[PDB]
Amino acid sequence: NRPNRLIVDEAINEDNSVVSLSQPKMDELQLFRGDTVLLKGKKRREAVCIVLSDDTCSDEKIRMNRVVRNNLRVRLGDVISIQPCPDVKYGKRIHVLPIDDTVEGITGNLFEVYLKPYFLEAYRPIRKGDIFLVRGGMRAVEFKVVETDPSPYCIVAPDTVIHCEGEPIKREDEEESLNEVGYDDIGGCRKQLAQIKEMVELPLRHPALFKAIGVKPPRGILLYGPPGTGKTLIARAVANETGAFAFLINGPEIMSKLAGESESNLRKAFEEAEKNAPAIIFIDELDAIAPKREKTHGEVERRIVSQLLTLMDGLKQRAHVIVMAATNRPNSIDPALRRFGRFDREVDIGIPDATGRLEILQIHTKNMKLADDVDLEQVANETHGHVGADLAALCSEAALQAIRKKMDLIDLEDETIDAEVMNSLAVTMDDFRWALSQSNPSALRETVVEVPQVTWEDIGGLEDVKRELQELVQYPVEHPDKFLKFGMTPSKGVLFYGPPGCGKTLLAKAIANECQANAISIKGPELLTMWFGESEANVREIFDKARQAAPCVLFFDELDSIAKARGGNIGDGGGAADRVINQILTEMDGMSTKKNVFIIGATNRPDIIDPAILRPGRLDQLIYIPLPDEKSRVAILKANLRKSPVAKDVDLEFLAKMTNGFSGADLTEICQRACKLAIRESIESEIRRERERQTNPSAMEVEEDDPVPEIRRDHFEEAMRFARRSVSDNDIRKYEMFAQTLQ
Amino acid sequence: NGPEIMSKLAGESESNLRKAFEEAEKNAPAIIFIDELDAIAPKREKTHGEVERRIVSQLLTLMDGLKQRAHVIVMAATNRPNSIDPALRRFGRFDREVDIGIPDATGRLEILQIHTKNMKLADDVDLEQVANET
């Protein structure tokens, strides 16, 4: 609705000093011809200069020299706030000096060769930060701000004095790029970024607006996350978006200095941050300054932790200063800092999922010059365990392997052709596959949180189980009003039991998929690790994480692992009590339903699970997953072969008909054996025909007809000739007895 | 040389390590070699003192101040991977590793050849059989 809130679009006058008009808009403005109009955009950098060299284009979209997009803006679709501010002072003059592309060739004076013919009767109505193109030649070189005799911008005049003593610097441009970093650059963490924005942007942009109510803003934020996730870029991007100041503190850099000099820098940091407008301080590798004091032994260490604490306690809320710190884990710093008034809010970065890795590949892949076969999606999905720095390494590896393996006899010779052939250079899928072959992910042991994609199209039947699940997990998160009306207490668990590998792990994920909620899976080997290692404190981390990421269906399978470890039902002299079970019970009893975190269990031998966990306030529910009946195996098969070709001579319904009861993994084994037979047959036929072509000197005999680009029935009949019923009827009867009489 | 750096005084230890990188930066593409890194940056659980961490911090900060525009690369020699502070095994720091290993029968033949040049051997000397039983 703001009248001067209008889009900006393409421009044709290669001189940036021109700014457009829109006569219907000029009638709205007081836009006068002369020196300058203040056209305001983002990050406070503007493109202020002479005006009215436009009205060639349509209205509602101001024509602004494209070079004022990289500056003052980012892309199209933006909006300008054009408001005149002509008649600026006439100081001495504005800086003259190039930046990047002038040392390449004759330099002379850098003013009187190429740039002099442009400050003619248009004597630079400018604003420091306006960047453009000006030359007396190839017509592509920048003109940047270096000096400032008058603080505000002016209109130059002759007879002045200029010093091109300055040098063009290529490296400083990289520093400018760091300033340039913005939301789109950083990727792979969207939900986490939204919280940081809603936390820090609103207090910053309008301080008095948030102060009027007077509620407390945050003082400090602590970021978790393994290395390489990208945390410096987040802080720099936030600072760039809020147009505020910044200050970086490196822990190792502070530690290196002398004992006396260590405190001076840390005091100066806060002093300088306090001397400016709303600012943000960033501390990287906090563990190097304030680690768990049981490890540290000395005098300087505590004498610096105390200084950090006292400085953190002297803000007073009237300075509009916020601080963020980077640390690997929460249990790695002195708990003194994790207190109210000190660091009190935490945000976890995590590990990018399949969606985020695609964004990271996109941001990195910009000079790749890819081919049609490059399927970035397939590349991203098969990238388990990588982080924000492994992907860059993979891209570099693929690119350099292409460079070498292709120009194995070109790049070795010195000649400009190298650059030329770099234009001819491209990249193929095989390069990415090879790079993925020699890639060691830096994070494969960490707990995984994400939304599994498995849907009930992956498992056919279990209708009543579907209904019970949707009752237990779906309905509560939609209509709490019904619980309020009838005064109801949600149930917080459910237990499974039945034969082995009948899809239990394939159901929990399913409900998560229908709930769009994350999921976490834990298996018996972990439980054994905590038993033998006698470290059950880690059980508190899992729950803690489940609390940060909610909702989650925390799944425990092979619950009977520790039970069977000390024998079966008879077991040892003891009963059915252990340590990890006690910690599980404690954490369940100390959890609130109002965070919507669900817990699921699984086991094959339910008779050897402690009954101490089936009382109210706990699972208090038992569900039995049966052997698949008719046409459930049909859906299982369709899921199995949906990634492999299949002919029509084979009918999955026939395969289902032949079997009279089987487990879940056995059908997968049958399909895999059929696939193995197909692969062996194809390879053998191909090699035999290749030998026929070799021994026979038929220099030209073209024949490309794969005898088996698919699968036939023969494979499945051969598979049927060797198959096992993985479960006996005695187990079925035992489960029947376990059903007891449920009167 | 790590032991050479540790021998000097506490104050003088850092000057040499700074001068090394300064000189490496003053030349064309150069390579820095550090031998027996364990003597300067061992697992901090073993080390107890002030100079040790005050030198590890200097090493880290110097390794973090290259900027990619100097064409300087560094190689370090260490017995085992789990023998140094994990701080150095991070991105931007030492990030690539190569294992030398124990030469096999083929390699020992090459070593024998490189050493055996003034031997003045006889006919019966069958270097192959010597190499295999080594």
HEC states along A284-337?
ECHHHCCCCCCCCCCCHHHHHHHHHHHHHCCCCCCCCEEEEEECCCCCCCCCCC
**Backbone φ, ψ for residue A219 (5° rounding):** -95, -40
Q: Which of A255, A286, A292 to mutate to test the interface with B (most CBs of B within 10 A)?
A: A255
Length of chain B: 134
HSE, CB side, 13 Å, CA atoms: give it for residue A484.
6
> A131: closest CA among A164, A176, A86, A83?
A176
Q: How many Cα atoms are found within 13 Å in the side-chain-facing hemisphere of B100? A: 8
Q: Check CB contact under 8 Å for A252 and B60.
A: yes
Ramachandran category for residue A461: left, alpha or beta (phi over 0 → left; psi -120 to 50 → alpha): beta
The Cα of A255 is separated from the nearest Cα of chain B by a number of Å equal to 6
3-state secondary structure at position B73: strand
CA angle at residue A552 from A549 to A558, to 5 degrees? Answer: 125
CA A313 and chain centroid, separation? 34
The minimum CA-CA distance between B14 and chain A, rounded to whole Å, is: 10
Residue carrying the six token digits 């279990």: A462
Chain B residues with CB inside 8 Å of A297's CB? 48
Query: Closest Cα of chain B to A270: distance in Å?
Result: 22
Inter-chain contact B91–A298, Cβ cutoff 8 Å? Answer: no
CB contact, 8 Å: A255 with chain B? yes
Instruction: Find the farthest-apart pair of alpha carbons in chain B and give their distance in angstroms, rounded.
Output: 62
Residue A370, amino acid: L
**Token pair of A599, please?**
């817990």
Paired strand residues for A321: A279
List phi, psi (to 5°) of A38.
-80, 100
DSSP-derived letter for residue A626 is P
Amino acid identity of residue A674, one-letter, is A
B89 in contact with A, Cβ within 8 Å: no
Give me A12's structure tokens. Answer: 């044709």
Residue of chain B whose Cα is closest to the Cα of A328:
B87
| Residues A468, A472, A473, A479, CA torsion sign | positive
Q: How far apart are CA A324 and CA A345, in angstroms?
A: 10
Q: Which residue among A174, A227, A253 places its CB closest to the CB of B61?
A: A253
First to last CA, chain B: 31
CB pairs under 8 A, 24+ apart, for A646-651? A646/A710, A646/A711, A647/A710, A647/A711, A647/A712, A647/A713, A649/A712, A649/A713, A650/A711, A650/A712, A650/A713, A650/A716
Decide the pairing of beta strands A622-624 and A598-601: unpaired
Return d(Cα A5, Cα A28) in angstroms, integer.
Answer: 12
Residue owning tokens 């086991």: A603
> Closest Cα partner for A152 from A242, A46, A71?
A46
Mutate to test the interface with A, among B61, B89, B94 (most CBs of A within 10 A): B61
* Phi then psi dihedrals of residue A358, to 5 deg: -60, -45
Phi and psi based region of residue A323 (left: phi greater than 0; alpha: psi -120 to 50; beta: remaining)? beta
CB–CB contacts below 8 A, A to B: 30
Q: In the block, which residue shows the tokens 């085992």?
A: B80
Residue type (1 letter), A159? D
- Evaluate the CA torsion angle B19, B21, B27, B33 in order and state its sign: positive
| Separation CA A342–CA A729 (nearest Å) | 63
Q: Which residues pair with B30 in a beta bridge?
A: B72
The Cα–Cα gap between A637 and A628 comes to: 12
Mind telling me how many Å the CA of A170 is from chain B's nearest CA? 10
- In the three-class reduction of DSSP (H, G, I as helix; E, B as strand; rest coil), residue A681 is classed as helix
| Cα–Cα distance, A45 to A392 (Å, whole number) | 31
**Residue A253 distance to chain B (closest CA, Å):** 6
User: A393 to chain B: which residues are within 8 Å by CB?
Assistant: 95
Quick check: A443 contacting B, CB < 8 Å? no
Partners of B70 on chain A (C-beta within 8 Å) are none
Burial letters A109-124, b for 16+ CB under 10 A, else e: ebeebbbeeebeeebb
Q: What part of A 384-403 touches B (C-beta under 8 Å)?
A: 389, 393
Are the beta carbons of B64 and A300 separated by less than 8 Å? no
CB within 8 Å: A298 and B50: yes
Identify which of A480, A686, A679 has the alpha carbon closest to the alpha carbon of residue A593: A480
E-strand ranges in A400-550 read 493-497, 518-522
Q: Which spans in A206-231 are helix H?
A: 207-213
Q: Distance between CA A288 and CA A295 in Å, rounded?
A: 12
Contact across the interface for A255 and B50, Cβ inside 8 Å: no
- C-alpha closest to that of A31 among A67, A55, A8: A55
Q: Rounded to whole angstroms, how far apart are CA atoms A398 and A404?
A: 10
Tokens of A18: 């021109």
Q: Tell me the CA end-to-end span of chain A in Å, nearest whole number.
A: 69
Amino acid at the residue B51: V
Q: What are the tokens at A378?
A: 């397939």
User: B7: how many CB neighbours lie within 10 A of its CB?
Assistant: 11
The closest alpha carbon to A145, from A41, A238, A71, belongs to: A71
d(CA A686, CA A518): 46
Task: List the determination method.
Answer: cryo-EM
A191-205 and A232-242 helices cross at what angle (nearest 10)?
Answer: 40
User: How far is C-alpha A708 from the geometric centre of its chain's CA atoms?
Assistant: 42
A441 touches chain B (CB under 8 A): no
**Contact with chain B for residue A256, Cβ under 8 A:** yes
- Min Cα distance B61 → chain A (Å) is 6
Torsion angles phi and psi, residue A656, rounded to 5: -60, -40
Give resolution in angstroms. 3.4
B69 closest CB neighbour out of A171, A227, A389 = A171
